[PDB]
Design an enzyme around this catalytic site. Structure first.
Site, short mmCIF file in Angstrom:
data_model
loop_
_atom_site.label_atom_id
_atom_site.label_comp_id
_atom_site.label_asym_id
_atom_site.label_seq_id
_atom_site.Cartn_x
_atom_site.Cartn_y
_atom_site.Cartn_z
N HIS A 136 0.66 -1.10 -0.05
CA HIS A 136 0.12 0.30 0.13
C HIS A 136 0.58 1.16 -0.23
O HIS A 136 0.10 2.06 0.43
CB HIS A 136 -1.38 0.15 1.59
CG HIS A 136 -0.29 0.29 2.20
ND1 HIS A 136 -0.29 -0.65 3.64
CD2 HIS A 136 -0.16 1.43 2.98
CE1 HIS A 136 -0.12 0.18 4.90
NE2 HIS A 136 0.46 1.40 4.00
N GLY A 181 2.82 6.65 9.74
CA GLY A 181 3.73 5.85 9.41
C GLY A 181 5.14 5.28 10.21
O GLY A 181 5.85 4.96 9.43
N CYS A 200 4.33 1.91 9.47
CA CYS A 200 3.78 1.30 8.74
C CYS A 200 5.17 0.67 8.11
O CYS A 200 5.68 1.22 7.64
CB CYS A 200 2.54 1.34 7.13
SG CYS A 200 1.26 1.58 7.75
#
EC number: 3.4.19.12
Lengths: 301, 306
Positions: free
Chosen positions: B41, B143, B145
């Site tokens: 993603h 942030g 991820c």
């Protein structure tokens, strides 16, 4: 979202850990540039510790009696000296993994990460606080001596603690990186004991702001209080008195949640007098005090 | 002495963290040899995550559109492909800090350390457990991820989790390093929610064994229980059903302490129905469930890493 007792990443410290051996005694050392720092009682036996004279013990040693090992490889000791309760060993080669660092002395109530090691090998990392009585509630089996505590700001490691001793009650005592003990403890087997401890109020308040930030807010109320009124109650429950400086420090968190510091103090006052009634805050059934205001801001913002 | 929840030393993982950017979307990636792994993603910039056909966006993306950064160094992407919910980027440099590693998919209840990262730089490390409902109660900001969870065995790093998202309750969901999600969760904007969770019974029992090992044994009693009777009680307190397999897993701690597992179950039964009476266990007011039986052996018997 979420809130965890969080340690600094330990990599920069891992690359400085070494093994130091004297006869039958082995512990951890810190290798920065061409110097290895370790607790001086490495030159003692379990029996030497009753009443050691470190000057006597050290003069009977030569560079050659110190076995320093980085992993497998022995490092050649070419110099030795004592700095308070630390031994400093010069080695003939520099640690390329040496980070940007400083040695700092912290105050009680402040927190830091510990890299527990055994035989020069990193085993685990955890976060703790320097209790008001200068002990640490640590996890330190025998051979952990020499393990260090630290903070990281940007790319710079601030070493603030090295482990030396366990006390009769099972709490831990150590020094800064100049070999000066935190608290009135010494490196010998004495009946020495820690003073009665206290709850770090400033940290509890920070933690409650963290709870409110994460949606946990059942404990809040309509009341406000004065600093004086709060201190009279807090002190009845063995909490540190709160000062204006400490109120000022909670400012940002107050602004972020829109809950006045003195309103949060009123909430704490009620929790102290009433108890939590089985309820929990951020998963805990007791008030946590090992997060500083900066810790909370860092994690929650 | 003293007993504490500890994370693994994170050094070997720190050396693998990088920054991966597509457009206005920046997150973390895992750099092993000449491959960088990150959540797929990352190509959604700043694209709605409603119903994206990742396949399509990916086929449209070029190598030069990925900005990969390791320190001050920009890594040149020379290839890209998708593996389930992950993106795999081939770079021209094999990571010199690559440790010995393996990818493993863990079971619910198992614990691991998480290295929280932002813009490719490690910020903090903590220990947690895969909940029975297949989420983790992590601590993540925007942030994060691409942050990974891992165990260390001797000198080998076992990667077991990569962070993908936060659910409505503030808990977290992610994949193994094959890009397969833990739980029924998906990396898109939907009405997904964490199911009801339970207390990890295997871990509470391991923790009680740890306490006894550490001389904290006031809660022991002279009675025993059948597995069935234990489950009837504990499940009323939202505990996971205990199985014979769990009982066998506790075997080594049972042997070390000389306390039969069902004997320890009776103490736990008594603790649940009566409370602690203000007493503590390992300095704790609550029954800890984020220590596995192996965590206990490791920390009590031993133990370091190469």
């Amino acid at each position: 979202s979420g809130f965890r007792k969080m340690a600094f990443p330990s990599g920069k410290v891992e690359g400085c850990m070494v093994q130091v051996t004297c006869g039958t005694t082995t512990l951890n050392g810190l290798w920065l540039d061409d110097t290895v720092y370790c607790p001086r009682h490495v030159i003692c036996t379990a029996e030497d510790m009753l009443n050691p004279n470190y000057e006597d013990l050290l003069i009977r040693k030569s560079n050659h009696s110190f076995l320093v090992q980085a992993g497998n490889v022995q490092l050649r000791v070419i110099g030795h000296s004592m700095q308070n309760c630390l031994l400093r060993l010069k080695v003939d080669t520099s640690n390329p993994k040496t980070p940007k660092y400083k040695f700092v002395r912290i105050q009680p109530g402040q927190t830091f990460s510990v890299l527990a090691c055994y035989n020069g090998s990193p085993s685990g990392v955890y976060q703790c606080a320097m209790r008001p009585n200068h002990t640490i509630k640590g996890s330190f089996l025998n051979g952990s001596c020499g393990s260090v505590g630290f903070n990281i700001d940007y790319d710079c490691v601030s070493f603030c603690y090295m482990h030396h001793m366990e006390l009769p009650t099972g709490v831990h005592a150590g020094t800064d990186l100049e070999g000066k003990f935190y608290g009135p403890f010494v490196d010998r087997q004495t009946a020495q004991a820690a003073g009665t401890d206290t709850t770090i109020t400033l940290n509890v308040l920070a933690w409650l702001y963290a709870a409110v930030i994460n949606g946990d807010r059942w404990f809040l109320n309509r009341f406000t209080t004065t600093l004086n009124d709060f201190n009279l109650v807090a002190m009845k429950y063995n909490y540190e008195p709160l000062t204006q400086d400490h109120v000022d420090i909670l400012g940002p968190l107050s602004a972020q949640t829109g809950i006045a510091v003195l309103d949060m103090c009123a909430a704490l006052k009620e929790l102290l007098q009433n108890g939590m009634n089985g309820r929990t805050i951020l998963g805990s059934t007791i008030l946590e005090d090992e997060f500083t205001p900066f810790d909370v801001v860092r994690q929650c913002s």
